Design an enzyme around this catalytic site. Sequence first.
Site, PDB file in Angstrom:
ATOM      1  N   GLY A  98      72.617 -19.186 -13.585  1.00  0.00           N
ATOM      2  CA  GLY A  98      73.375 -18.656 -12.596  1.00  0.00           C
ATOM      3  C   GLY A  98      72.416 -18.308 -11.274  1.00  0.00           C
TER       4      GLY A  98
ATOM      5  N   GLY B  37      69.362 -17.731 -11.325  1.00  0.00           N
ATOM      6  CA  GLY B  37      67.720 -17.942 -11.666  1.00  0.00           C
ATOM      7  C   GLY B  37      66.959 -16.588 -11.432  1.00  0.00           C
TER       8      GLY B  37
ATOM      9  N   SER C  37      69.058  -7.384  -8.299  1.00  0.00           N
ATOM     10  CA  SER C  37      69.116  -8.541  -8.006  1.00  0.00           C
ATOM     11  C   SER C  37      70.387  -9.026  -7.782  1.00  0.00           C
ATOM     12  CB  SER C  37      68.449  -9.386  -9.297  1.00  0.00           C
ATOM     13  OG  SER C  37      69.413  -8.979 -10.254  1.00  0.00           O
TER      14      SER C  37
ATOM     15  N   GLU D  77      71.983  -9.988  -5.053  1.00  0.00           N
ATOM     16  CA  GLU D  77      72.317 -10.900  -4.255  1.00  0.00           C
ATOM     17  C   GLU D  77      72.383 -12.177  -4.675  1.00  0.00           C
ATOM     18  OE1 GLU D  77      68.647  -9.163  -1.866  1.00  0.00           O
ATOM     19  OE2 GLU D  77      69.574 -10.169  -0.413  1.00  0.00           O
ATOM     20  N   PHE D  78      71.711 -12.517  -5.947  1.00  0.00           N
ATOM     21  CA  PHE D  78      71.645 -13.607  -6.683  1.00  0.00           C
ATOM     22  C   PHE D  78      72.135 -13.664  -8.044  1.00  0.00           C
ATOM     23  CE2 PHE D  78      67.928 -13.114  -3.861  1.00  0.00           C
ATOM     24  CZ  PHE D  78      68.467 -13.785  -2.583  1.00  0.00           C
TER      25      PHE D  78
ATOM     26  N   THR E  93      71.802 -18.669 -25.428  1.00  0.00           N
ATOM     27  CA  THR E  93      71.620 -19.374 -26.753  1.00  0.00           C
ATOM     28  C   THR E  93      72.859 -19.849 -27.505  1.00  0.00           C
ATOM     29  OG1 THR E  93      71.619 -17.337 -27.995  1.00  0.00           O
ATOM     30  CG2 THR E  93      69.421 -17.937 -27.034  1.00  0.00           C
TER      31      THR E  93
ATOM     32  N   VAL F 131      78.358 -21.062 -22.736  1.00  0.00           N
ATOM     33  CA  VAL F 131      78.638 -20.811 -21.345  1.00  0.00           C
ATOM     34  C   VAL F 131      79.643 -19.643 -21.397  1.00  0.00           C
ATOM     35  CG1 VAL F 131      78.783 -21.275 -18.958  1.00  0.00           C
ATOM     36  CG2 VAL F 131      78.362 -23.163 -20.928  1.00  0.00           C
TER      37      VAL F 131
ATOM     38  N   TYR G 160      60.518   2.693 -15.457  1.00  0.00           N
ATOM     39  CA  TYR G 160      60.087   1.553 -14.813  1.00  0.00           C
ATOM     40  C   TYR G 160      58.594   1.722 -14.516  1.00  0.00           C
ATOM     41  CZ  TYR G 160      62.182  -2.640 -12.765  1.00  0.00           C
ATOM     42  OH  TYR G 160      62.624  -3.841 -12.718  1.00  0.00           O
TER      43      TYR G 160
HETATM   44  C1  LIG Z   1      63.410  -8.491  -8.110  1.00  0.00           C
HETATM   45  C2  LIG Z   1      64.214  -8.545  -9.595  1.00  0.00           C
HETATM   46  C3  LIG Z   1      65.113  -7.318  -9.599  1.00  0.00           C
HETATM   47  C4  LIG Z   1      65.763  -7.157 -10.846  1.00  0.00           C
HETATM   48  N1  LIG Z   1      66.471  -5.996 -11.047  1.00  0.00           N
HETATM   49  C5  LIG Z   1      67.400  -6.063 -12.081  1.00  0.00           C
HETATM   50  C6  LIG Z   1      68.075  -4.969 -12.327  1.00  0.00           C
HETATM   51  O1  LIG Z   1      68.130  -3.573 -11.671  1.00  0.00           O
HETATM   52  N2  LIG Z   1      69.008  -4.800 -13.697  1.00  0.00           N
HETATM   53  C7  LIG Z   1      69.003  -5.801 -14.344  1.00  0.00           C
HETATM   54  O2  LIG Z   1      69.460  -5.477 -15.584  1.00  0.00           O
HETATM   55  N3  LIG Z   1      68.172  -6.903 -14.151  1.00  0.00           N
HETATM   56  C8  LIG Z   1      67.466  -7.034 -13.190  1.00  0.00           C
HETATM   57  N4  LIG Z   1      66.632  -8.014 -12.851  1.00  0.00           N
HETATM   58  C9  LIG Z   1      66.983  -9.378 -13.805  1.00  0.00           C
HETATM   59  C10 LIG Z   1      67.925 -10.195 -13.769  1.00  0.00           C
HETATM   60  O3  LIG Z   1      68.617 -10.185 -12.332  1.00  0.00           O
HETATM   61  C11 LIG Z   1      69.029 -10.036 -14.713  1.00  0.00           C
HETATM   62  O4  LIG Z   1      68.364 -10.102 -15.997  1.00  0.00           O
HETATM   63  C12 LIG Z   1      70.317 -10.826 -14.492  1.00  0.00           C
HETATM   64  O5  LIG Z   1      71.356 -10.388 -15.319  1.00  0.00           O
HETATM   65  C13 LIG Z   1      70.153 -12.258 -14.642  1.00  0.00           C
HETATM   66  O6  LIG Z   1      70.978 -12.843 -14.149  1.00  0.00           O
HETATM   67  P1  LIG Z   1      71.171 -14.310 -13.256  1.00  0.00           P
HETATM   68  O7  LIG Z   1      72.463 -14.590 -12.704  1.00  0.00           O
HETATM   69  O8  LIG Z   1      70.127 -14.575 -12.349  1.00  0.00           O
HETATM   70  O9  LIG Z   1      71.036 -15.180 -14.612  1.00  0.00           O
HETATM   71  P2  LIG Z   1      69.837 -16.387 -14.755  1.00  0.00           P
HETATM   72  O10 LIG Z   1      68.275 -16.022 -14.817  1.00  0.00           O
HETATM   73  O11 LIG Z   1      70.132 -17.325 -14.143  1.00  0.00           O
HETATM   74  O12 LIG Z   1      70.118 -16.222 -16.543  1.00  0.00           O
HETATM   75  C14 LIG Z   1      69.773 -15.466 -17.161  1.00  0.00           C
HETATM   76  C15 LIG Z   1      69.970 -15.955 -18.978  1.00  0.00           C
HETATM   77  O13 LIG Z   1      71.251 -16.099 -18.952  1.00  0.00           O
HETATM   78  C16 LIG Z   1      71.503 -17.473 -19.037  1.00  0.00           C
HETATM   79  N5  LIG Z   1      72.897 -17.777 -18.280  1.00  0.00           N
HETATM   80  C17 LIG Z   1      73.097 -17.658 -16.863  1.00  0.00           C
HETATM   81  N6  LIG Z   1      74.571 -17.804 -16.699  1.00  0.00           N
HETATM   82  C18 LIG Z   1      74.925 -18.049 -17.942  1.00  0.00           C
HETATM   83  C19 LIG Z   1      76.472 -18.177 -18.329  1.00  0.00           C
HETATM   84  N7  LIG Z   1      77.378 -17.637 -17.447  1.00  0.00           N
HETATM   85  N8  LIG Z   1      76.706 -18.110 -19.878  1.00  0.00           N
HETATM   86  C20 LIG Z   1      75.845 -18.191 -20.903  1.00  0.00           C
HETATM   87  N9  LIG Z   1      74.214 -18.230 -20.236  1.00  0.00           N
HETATM   88  C21 LIG Z   1      73.996 -17.917 -18.997  1.00  0.00           C
HETATM   89  C22 LIG Z   1      70.416 -18.248 -18.709  1.00  0.00           C
HETATM   90  O14 LIG Z   1      70.464 -19.487 -19.449  1.00  0.00           O
HETATM   91  C23 LIG Z   1      69.432 -17.408 -19.080  1.00  0.00           C
HETATM   92  O15 LIG Z   1      69.081 -17.231 -20.596  1.00  0.00           O
HETATM   93  C24 LIG Z   1      65.867  -8.355 -11.756  1.00  0.00           C
HETATM   94  C25 LIG Z   1      65.168  -9.426 -11.467  1.00  0.00           C
HETATM   95  C26 LIG Z   1      64.500  -9.489 -10.143  1.00  0.00           C
HETATM   96  C27 LIG Z   1      63.630 -10.826 -10.151  1.00  0.00           C
END
Ligand SMILES: Cc1cc2nc3c(=O)[nH]c(=O)nc-3n(C[C@H](O)[C@H](O)[C@H](O)COP(=O)(O)OP(=O)(O)OC[C@H]3O[C@@H](n4cnc5c(N)ncnc54)[C@H](O)[C@@H]3O)c2cc1C
Lengths: 543, 555
Positions: free
Chosen positions: B147, B149, B215, B217-218, B281, B284, B475
């Site tokens: 999603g 990343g 995160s 925003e993404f 794992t 989706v 943290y």
């Molecule tokens: C600067 C920064 C700040 C952050 N702050 C937080 C925070 O405050 N709280 C927090 O919990 N996390 C935080 N994170 C970590 C991260 O954003 C979370 O873990 C978030 O849930 C990841 O979501 P994503 O959409 O980017 O998933 P991705 O990184 O794209 O995916 C993460 C995992 O889930 C899988 N995945 C993605 N979409 C699906 C789908 N729909 N079905 C099955 N599997 C899927 C991927 O294959 C991967 O294993 C932060 C990361 C960064 C870099």
Amino acid sequence: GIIPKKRQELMKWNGWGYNDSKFFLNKKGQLELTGKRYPLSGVALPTFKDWIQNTFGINLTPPSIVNEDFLHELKKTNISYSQEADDRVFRAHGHCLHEIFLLREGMFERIPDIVLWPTCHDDVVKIVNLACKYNLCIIPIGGGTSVSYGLMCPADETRTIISLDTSQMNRILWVDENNLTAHVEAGITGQELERQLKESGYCTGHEPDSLEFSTVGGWISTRASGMKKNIYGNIEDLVVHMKVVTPRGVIEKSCQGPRMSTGPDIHHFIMGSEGTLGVITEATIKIRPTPEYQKYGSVAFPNFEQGVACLREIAKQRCAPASIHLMDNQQFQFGHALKPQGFDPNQLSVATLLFEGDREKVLQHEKQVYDIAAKFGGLAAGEDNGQRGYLLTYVIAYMRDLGLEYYIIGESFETSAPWDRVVDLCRNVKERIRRECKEKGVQFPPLSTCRVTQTYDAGACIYFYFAFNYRGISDPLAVFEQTEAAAREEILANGGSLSHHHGVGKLRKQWLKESISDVGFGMLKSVKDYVDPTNIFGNRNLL
Amino acid sequence: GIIPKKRQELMKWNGWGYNDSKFFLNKKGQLELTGKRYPLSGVALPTFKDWIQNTFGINLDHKTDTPPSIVNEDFLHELKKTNISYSQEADDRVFRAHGHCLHEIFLLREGMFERIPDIVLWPTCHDDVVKIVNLACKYNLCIIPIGGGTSVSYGLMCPADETRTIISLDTSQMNRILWVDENNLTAHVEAGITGQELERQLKESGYCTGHEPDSLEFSTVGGWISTRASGMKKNIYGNIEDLVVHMKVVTPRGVIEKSCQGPRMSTGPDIHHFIMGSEGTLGVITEATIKIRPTPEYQKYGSVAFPNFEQGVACLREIAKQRCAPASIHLMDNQQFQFGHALKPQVSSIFTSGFDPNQLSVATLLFEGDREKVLQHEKQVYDIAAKFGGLAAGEDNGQRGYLLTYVIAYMRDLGLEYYIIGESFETSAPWDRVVDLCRNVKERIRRECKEKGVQFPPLSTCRVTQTYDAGACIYFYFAFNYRGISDPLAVFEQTEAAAREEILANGGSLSHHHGVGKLRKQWLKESISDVGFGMLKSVKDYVDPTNIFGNRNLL
Ligand SMILES: Cc1cc2nc3c(=O)[nH]c(=O)nc-3n(C[C@H](O)[C@H](O)[C@H](O)COP(=O)(O)OP(=O)(O)OC[C@H]3O[C@@H](n4cnc5c(N)ncnc54)[C@H](O)[C@@H]3O)c2cc1C
Ligand SMILES: Cc1cc2nc3c(=O)[nH]c(=O)nc-3n(C[C@H](O)[C@H](O)[C@H](O)COP(=O)(O)OP(=O)(O)OC[C@H]3O[C@@H](n4cnc5c(N)ncnc54)[C@H](O)[C@@H]3O)c2cc1C
Ligand SMILES: CCCCCCCCCCCCO
């Protein structure tokens, strides 16, 4: 609080609760509870006979089969056990109408072969190992309060069935004052748990109506929900740690972190597993300072619909008191006829309230609820309608036995549902029950009543009471069982869940697959097969 | 907020966030963020440079083919009939080959990944995902969902020895709100929608979820569910496990979905919990029902200064015991307070460096809700804070901290430009371990760095970011100048692993919210027990018999 090994000594062998507590007629022709255990014990109820009469239209053993070399090794452990018929029969059932009927008027097809009483986690480990080595079947029992056929032994189970009884494994191990948790053995009851915490200034606040007998391990197994979950959480919020003995070994997390992200939460593989995977032996539970003050309240509404709208608004503003129930008219009167000593009285509905916490807080909260209720035509209805609406959830199981002595069968069932389905669901389900009873030849319209018992952000828990005079009805049980399956169909057709907290057991098995999907079911099966490949935990609940 | 397919157009291909947002030296020689997205964007930060210099011992004057696409022709022919968008372009594939761990970023800047997805797919609906999973059964393919990343656990890293065709199944085009239910206060959404876009769209109807991880925003709904995400205002809104009311999941075995939308059930072990924390794992997640709330009337920021960290912790504990945590409360240590201070606009003199100012700690507070309740609440919290030596440090310090959360990730890139590597990591712990864990973990980091021949003491700072009944989330941030060091990635990676040992040994968990991915696999069995590990394996083996979902996170 500690259940003795020989249960029938102080508990009814064919009914709910203690021997010393049953409704009888005092020397003034009024119904009254026996004994000294309760608030209502010894309290006469002038109006209750008149309520029953007007409402219902009435006046007022298998041999022990056990391997001898297993038995020999068990003698070595020094774990207490019994092959006595009354011990085994006591543990062969929960508190379904069906099962209680059988005890009064027949016998079970299958009952445990032997009873074992471990006192600790290591004893449980030995027992599970012995059952592996000797190919035995284990059904765990705590309170014996299951209402889902969860303790019923499968008729065709040909192995030795061990009833593993957790009642002597009932210690508080440590109370952690810094973290506000208590680590306990799984066989401790709600009553005994609260009594002991209270002495140190704490509580759990977990109050299922069966807390007197129902245990920590039972709550985890069945996903138990308590009366004050709005403050304390349901069981899945209260538990922070557990230890479980499965044929495969011991499940236990390495740390006591409040919240983790370490993969799917294996605590959820165990909660709701209804005795099918192993024995929970130890659990860590959140505790809280004892509340300073308690207050009951109540509210009258023009009809059920307005009351429901009001509870919804309460949940929307996230200011539910410790407990809030909404009773429909019938139940309100059921309750009203429990007293000692306008709006259209057909549809008039009453909410009961319980507030707890610091006094000016409570008092300030109470004013916030009434204002909200004002918007919906609700008027403060006073304390004692509050009190006695609740005691109506607490003694009911005594009433059901009384009912049976006078040809009345009744039971309760529950569902959860989304907020926009509650009104239609209650109305349609109550009606379905009346219609089914008519069509099956019941002469008097049954009691068909509901109350809203839990609010959540997304919906509510709905409770139903169903009961009829089985006068000149040939087959009273089976009519009943059919009517209750029809009521489930009506519930699911109106968007309600299979169960909110009672669980599935063997009673609601046929519906599980569509409720959780095929793959969902498959996932559950695959955990069972991994943890318990030889199906030692063969009560056959759920799947 | 709708992610376009070609991400590198708007987003950095070798780092965090948007292309238009980076740190730089302006014409007065001061650190400043380009662009306009953030409240700090286009604001000069006079004192930042000194702090970098004082804290890191660098003057700030010193800066610093792709694998072929292997894909079966007949699969590809069948994919063309679906009309599902795909790409085999290198930059699309490289983009989706990583998350945001230091190590991954380092690699993007200075090398190349051993293994990257072979093809990218962009399903726009649940049925597409079913076609794609069917296609991968048929053709023996491997699928890694992505999603946002934004994984910080190697959750997205392709295993080097994975020989099958890897599909990066991108959920960004699956982002609609399918229905907003106002009677029930729930929204049903597609899993690929981001925090930012989800809230923006609910706001137009008067609603929000209030799930705000840094995160947002993404990061996406599906992502949050996979990683057990935790948001800043979980005190009001719940974490992901509390927010989700329903989900729909596509697995090689078929489709996981409950039949009803009840708030709470007893129908055996809760299968939602099998899917939360599964980290890509099992299949989706395509759709999900989430709680919503009316947009809060009013927000208020605050802050409180304490004599030391310890007293601050004791106050946080007490706030949790009375169960009156604000929507958000952070307690930052001294270093972090001082860092906050470096980010104000007042230009100091160049001949210039009853609370002790290198001991004090600050808690930042955010309250939200109805104006009247907020204000009672605010007053209630301060009264408690006062019993611990706490004095209100005012709302501007409050607002500042809560803004700086979303700009911190851009700072890491800046550091890497000037030879500084840094990373955050987190844990949850019982209340009675928090003080010792913070002290020992920070001290472990220093010891490790010195012993590995880092010249200058590393930045080693912590804050408490969440309170619960049973404990807290802590943290950490850890950073050092790696100039002169032979193998900087190895040094960093070894230090971060020692901190992790130091954490477990002090009573803390493997993760509070970032999760396990491939970064923390070695500790899982001991965390969850062997049988616990065994149970997860059995679900994976049932739901994904041929390991189509082969990112190899967790197990
Ligand atoms: C600067 C920064 C700040 C952050 N702050 C937080 C925070 O405050 N709280 C927090 O919990 N996390 C935080 N994170 C970590 C991260 O954003 C979370 O873990 C978030 O849930 C990841 O979501 P994503 O959409 O980017 O998933 P991705 O990184 O794209 O995916 C993460 C995992 O889930 C899988 N995945 C993605 N979409 C699906 C789908 N729909 N079905 C099955 N599997 C899927 C991927 O294959 C991967 O294993 C932060 C990361 C960064 C870099
Ligand atoms: C009058 C009455 C009121 C009730 N009120 C409520 C209520 O308010 N809320 C609510 O949620 N329920 C209520 N119940 C239902 C029931 O009390 C709960 O499900 C209770 O949690 C079961 O606990 P128990 O110790 O009696 O378990 P049991 O009846 O002894 O066993 C229940 C199931 O759990 C398994 N099991 C028991 N102990 C263990 C163990 N330690 N390890 C593994 N498996 C085990 C058993 O094999 C069985 O499948 C009520 C029942 C009655 C009769
Ligand atoms: C005298 C009236 C009989 C009413 C029958 C109601 C029985 C409900 C008891 C079941 C207990 C489960 O909570």
